[PDB]
Design a protein around this ligand. Structure first.
Ligand SMILES: C[C@H](CCC(=O)NCCC[N+](C)(C)CCCS(=O)(=O)[O-])[C@H]1CC[C@H]2[C@@H]3[C@H](O)C[C@@H]4C[C@H](O)CC[C@]4(C)[C@H]3C[C@H](O)[C@]12C
Ligand SMILES: *C/C=C(C)/C=C/C=C(C)/C=C/C1=C(C)CCCC1(C)C
Ligand SMILES: CCCCCCCCCCCCCC
Ligand SMILES: CCCCCCCCCCCC
Ligand SMILES: CCCCCCCCCC
Ligand SMILES: CCCCCCCCCC
Ligand SMILES: CCCCCCCCCC
Ligand SMILES: CCCCCCCCCC
Ligand SMILES: CCCCCCCCCC
Ligand SMILES: CCCCCCCC
Ligand SMILES: CCCCCCCC
Ligand SMILES: CCCCCCCC
Length: 225
């Protein structure tokens, strides 16, 4: 009965509801293009749902020693992020008709970001944990850079309806994403200042906003047709 279970349960419910909702709305639409967005967008919270349910039931948590103590690390988060973050980027890539190579680089960078983040989370030498964290954050900044400069520019060539929608989704992604590394740094994976129960609350808020919130904005717009 870990203190943060209440947030894992709240996260489970929200990802679950969002999943079903997007799924229903998705299966009713007939437009080929919109169907693509709905599929990608529905899968995201569907995966988050399964990982959150897993954590709620006691999986994806391991004790890692560093700083002279045993620290609880939820590695299941990375299993979630490994697949969801690139799908979210895919959504944006499709919305602005980004080039194949740009997509590859983004997903690749994303892989580096999640992968190094996990190694960092499992590293036993306190100082090295932050080396991986920095490597990971740098990869994240490359992603946000391309989204902000590269994608926005690509968006300008689209109709104002698509560009505007992209901008909202872009802003939401930059704000929420730029926060993860800060939570990691001050939470149980980093300095251990914010306790795991509040940290789980923070990630849940960021996760729901970045997936279901993102989905609601995207799937409710005409930019997907
Ligand atoms: C029965 C299994 C395995 C036991 C070995 C254990 C492992 C994780 C446990 C849940 C979590 O602790 C979260 C939450 C805490 C509440 O307090 C009571 C309810 C709940 C849903 C727990 C129920 C049950 O206890 C679980 C499923
Ligand atoms: C639904 C989940 C989303 C949109 C998660 C996004 C997660 C990130 C942008 C995570 C970034 C991290 C770093 C930059 C470094 C430290 C470790 C991570 C994996 C928390
Ligand atoms: C030989 C050890 C080298 C360590 C380099 C660490 C770089 C850390 C950057 C983040 C620091 C966060 C402090 C809270
Ligand atoms: C004390 C009992 C808490 C039960 C919390 C349930 C949260 C949603 C679970 C959904 C499983 C599909
Ligand atoms: C995908 C091409 C650009 C890759 C940038 C990688 C940055 C890694 C920092 C650790
Ligand atoms: C792909 C780039 C990998 C960089 C690894 C750095 C490890 C530092 C350990 C102290
Ligand atoms: C690119 C190769 C990076 C190798 C890192 C090795 C780290 C060893 C820590 C004990
Ligand atoms: C021993 C002092 C190490 C300071 C590292 C600063 C790294 C800045 C870029 C992450
Ligand atoms: C002990 C300090 C190790 C620093 C490794 C930096 C790797 C940077 C890869 C981009
Ligand atoms: C066209 C709707 C696709 C839905 C895929 C859902 C996967 C959970
Ligand atoms: C992918 C690099 C992993 C390094 C692990 C080092 C464990 C001492
Ligand atoms: C948003 C930062 C919260 C910090 C809580 C610290 C409790 C010791």
């Amino acid at each position: 009965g870990r203190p943060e279970w209440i947030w894992l349960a709240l996260g489970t419910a929200l990802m679950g509801l969002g999943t079903l909702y997007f799924l229903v709305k998705g299966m009713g639409v007939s437009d080929p293009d919109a169907k693509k967005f709905y599929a990608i967008t529905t899968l995201v919270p569907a995966i988050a749902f399964t990982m959150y349910l897993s954590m709620l039931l006691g999986y994806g948590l391991t004790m890692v020693p560093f700083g002279g103590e045993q620290n609880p690390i939820y590695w299941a988060r990375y299993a979630d992020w490994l697949f969801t973050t690139p799908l979210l980027l895919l959504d944006l890539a499709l919305l602005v008709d980004a080039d194949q190579g740009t997509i590859l680089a983004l997903v690749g960078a994303d892989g580096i970001m999640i992968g190094t983040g996990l190694v960092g989370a499992l590293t036993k030498v306190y100082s090295y944990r932050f080396v991986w964290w920095a490597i990971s954050t740098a990869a994240m900044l490359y992603i946000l850079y391309v989204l902000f400069f590269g994608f926005t520019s690509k968006a300008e060539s689209m109709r104002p309806e698509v560009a505007s929608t992209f901008k909202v989704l872009r802003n939401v992604t930059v704000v929420l994403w730029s926060a993860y590394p800060v939570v990691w740094l001050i939470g149980s994976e980093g300095a251990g200042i914010v306790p795991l129960n509040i940290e789980t609350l923070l990630f849940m808020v960021l996760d729901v906003s970045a997936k279901v919130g993102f989905g609601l904005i995207l799937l409710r717009s005409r930019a997907i047709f």
